């Protein structure tokens, strides 16, 4: 379609379903997730968002990203820091795993944010809008499956405090995406990059599943 947001959604339908079909994610949906599994996914998210938000700040004033810059509404790094301090303890920075699959994702994020800025929107879109609109169902499952204490912490990642209405913010963000000016060629690369984002998540899930079944 003409609208980039609508174009992205349609192009990534296949891969998104592929992501839902991933073994690790299948179990997740079937309410089957363990503490070790959830810890691994949280650590992954921490690394992914550290890299993504590092690159967003580097290109926040660029006309190729500025229109979709919503730092207060979307930042997740601080939330994950809080969360990992719960899951891995006070020395979490020293013990959280940083696997090859995580490194491949982080590496693509830095390359994009450093040499192909116009493609950063593909990752911001995939991560932010994906986690926001899907957070509810993912958290619901997690908390009833993890049976954690009334600690009052460990899942801050699933709540975007600076966003009163998810649906409302989503349409705003989409509107801003469709306001972005880019050559047909770039537009194609952004759509491709979005598919690449899903592939990076899929290989991540495959790796985490592998680490948990020994
Ligand atoms: C537990 C597996 C998953 C399930 C069952 C799932 C579920 C959801 C739900 C409920 C929505 C909102 C409705 C919609 O699709 O429009 C959503 C949207 C989306 N998801 Fe997922 N998702 C999963 C994994 C992922 C992963 C791994 C990514 C990739 C980083 C992702 C990226 C997206 C994106 C970008 C959207 C927004 C699409 C749009 O409305 O334009 N999802 N997801």
Curated annotation (Swiss-Prot):
Enzyme class: oxidoreductase
One MF term in the entry's GO annotations: heme binding
Tissue: Expressed at higher levels in renal cancer tissue than in normal tissue (at protein level).
Residues engaged in binding heme b: 9, 16, 125, 174
Site (Important for catalytic activity): residue numbering on this chain: 131
Effect in UniProt of substituting residue 131 to A/H/N/F/L: Inactive as a heme oxygenase but active as a peroxidase
Quaternary structure, from the entry: (Microbial infection) Interacts with SARS-CoV-2 ORF3A protein; the interaction promotes ORF3A-induced autophagy but is unlikely to be involved in ORF3A-mediated induction of reticulophagy.
Disease tied to this entry: Heme oxygenase 1 deficiency: A disease characterized by impaired stress hematopoiesis, resulting in marked erythrocyte fragmentation and intravascular hemolysis, coagulation abnormalities, endothelial damage, and iron deposition in renal and hepatic tissues. Clinical features include persistent hemolytic anemia, asplenia, nephritis, generalized erythematous rash, growth retardation and hepatomegaly.
Protein name: Heme oxygenase 1
First and last residues shown, out of full length: 10 to 223 of 288
């Amino acid at each position: 379609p003409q609208d980039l947001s609508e174009a992205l959604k349609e192009a990534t339908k296949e891969v998104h379903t592929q992501a839902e079909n991933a073994e690790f994610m299948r179990n997740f949906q079937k309410g089957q997730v363990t503490r070790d599994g959830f810890k691994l996914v949280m650590a992954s998210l921490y690394h992914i968002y550290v890299a993504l938000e590092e690159e967003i700040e580097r290109n926040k004033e660029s006309p190729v990203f500025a229109p979709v810059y919503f730092p207060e509404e979307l930042h997740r790094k601080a939330a994950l820091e809080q969360d990992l301090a719960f899951w891995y303890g006070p020395r979490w920075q020293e013990v959280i795993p940083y696997t090859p699959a995580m490194q491949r994702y982080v590496k693509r994020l830095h390359e994009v944010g450093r040499t192909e800025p116009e493609l950063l929107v593909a990752h911001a879109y995939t991560r932010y809008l994906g986690d926001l609109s899907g957070g509810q169902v993912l958290k619901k499952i997690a908390q009833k499956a993890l049976d954690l204490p009334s600690s009052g912490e460990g899942l801050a990642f699933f709540t975007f405090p600076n966003i009163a209405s998810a649906t409302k913010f989503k349409q705003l963000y989409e509107s801003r995406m469709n306001s972005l000016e880019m050559t047909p060629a770039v537009r194609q690369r952004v759509i491709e990059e979005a598919k690449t984002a899903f592939l990076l998540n899929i290989q991540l899930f495959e790796e985490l599943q592998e680490l948990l079944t020994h």
